[PDB]
Structure 1
Amino acid sequence: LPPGWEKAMSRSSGRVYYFNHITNASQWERPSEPARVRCSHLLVKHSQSRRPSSWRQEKITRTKEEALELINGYIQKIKSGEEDFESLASQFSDCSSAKARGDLGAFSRGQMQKPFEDASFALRTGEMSGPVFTDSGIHIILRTE
């Protein structure tokens, strides 16, 4: 299995699934290192965020647990097809890259907080992460290239 992926048992179904410990992705199908990748993201900040402020809200007061909740709702809607990533990111991301549908352009290793970098480099093109925690808050990452 590609970097970070492991077999687990579903504790509802007892069906086998795969989870990734670097990106926090999880899925039923069996899964499948570039100099540069391109990613978008949807950030949800909380009161223990490095900077508890964003373009959406001068004072961010939601708890880390409430942030994780919002993130999990957005992941549910994205995975169900009910909203797309770009649209939730534009409305809801606490990063001002919300204005570009969450797009950050291409970067290589060396540039981002590590947990974000590692998640982005472990994603496959097209692939979306689970909740990824950094000092800025809780990220959903989409690898676009």
Structure 2
Amino acid sequence: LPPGWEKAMSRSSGRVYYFNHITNASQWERPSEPARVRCSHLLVKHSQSRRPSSWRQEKITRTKEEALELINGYIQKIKSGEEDFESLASQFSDCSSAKARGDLGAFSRGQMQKPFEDASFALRTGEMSGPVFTDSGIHIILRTE
């Protein structure tokens, strides 16, 4: 399995699924290193975020668990198709890159926070991560290139 993927057992169904411990993505299908990848991300800060402020809200008061619920809900709406990633990041991302539909443009290793970097280069083009915890908050990373 590609870097970070591992088999696990569904404790509801008993059916086998795959999770990645780098990106926090889990899926049912069996899954399938570039100098540069291109990502968008959706950020949801919390009161233990490095800077608990955003264009959305001068004083971010939600907790870290509440930040996770929101992220999980967004992950659910993206993955159901009831919303797409660009729409949610524009409305709800605590990162001012929301003004560019999440897009951060392309980067290489050594520029970002290491957990974000790791999740990003362990995404395949067109893949979305799970919640990705950094000091800014919790991320949904989409790798677009």
TM range (shorter): over 0.9
Matched residues in 1 for 2:102 and 2:110: separation?
20
RMSD: 0.2
Deviation at 1:48, TM superposition (A): 0.3
- Corresponding position of 1:128: 128
Matched residues in 1 for 2:52 and 2:136: separation?
8
- Corresponding position of 1:50: 50
- Residue-by-residue CA offset, 1:107-127 (whole Å, 9 max, x unaligned): 000100000000000000000
Instruction: Structure 1 unaligned segments of length 5 or more: list them.
Output: none
Work out the percentage of aligned pairs sharing the same amino acid.
Answer: 100
Matched residues in 1 for 2:52 and 2:34: separation?
33
Corresponding residue SS for 1:40: strand
Corresponding residue SS for 2:133: strand
Deviation at 1:90, TM superposition (A): 0.1
Deviation at 1:54, TM superposition (A): 0.2
Deviation at 1:29, TM superposition (A): 0.2
Figure out how many residues of one structure are paired with residues of the other and give that number: 145
Deviation at 1:22, TM superposition (A): 0.2
Matched residues in 1 for 2:132 and 2:110: separation?
18
Corresponding residue SS for 1:142: strand
Q: Which runs of 4+ in 1 moved over 3 A?
A: none
Deviation at 1:38, TM superposition (A): 0.1
Matched residues in 1 for 2:125 and 2:109: separation?
16
| TM-score, scaled to structure 1 | 1.00
- Corresponding position of 1:13: 13
Corresponding residue SS for 1:13: coil
| TM-score, scaled to structure 2 | 1.00
Corresponding residue SS for 1:42: strand
Deviation at 1:62, TM superposition (A): 0.1
- Residue-by-residue CA offset, 1:56-108 (whole Å, 9 max, x unaligned): 00000000000000000000000000000000000000000000000000000
Matched residues in 2 for 1:20 and 1:122: separation?
9
- Corresponding position of 2:96: 96
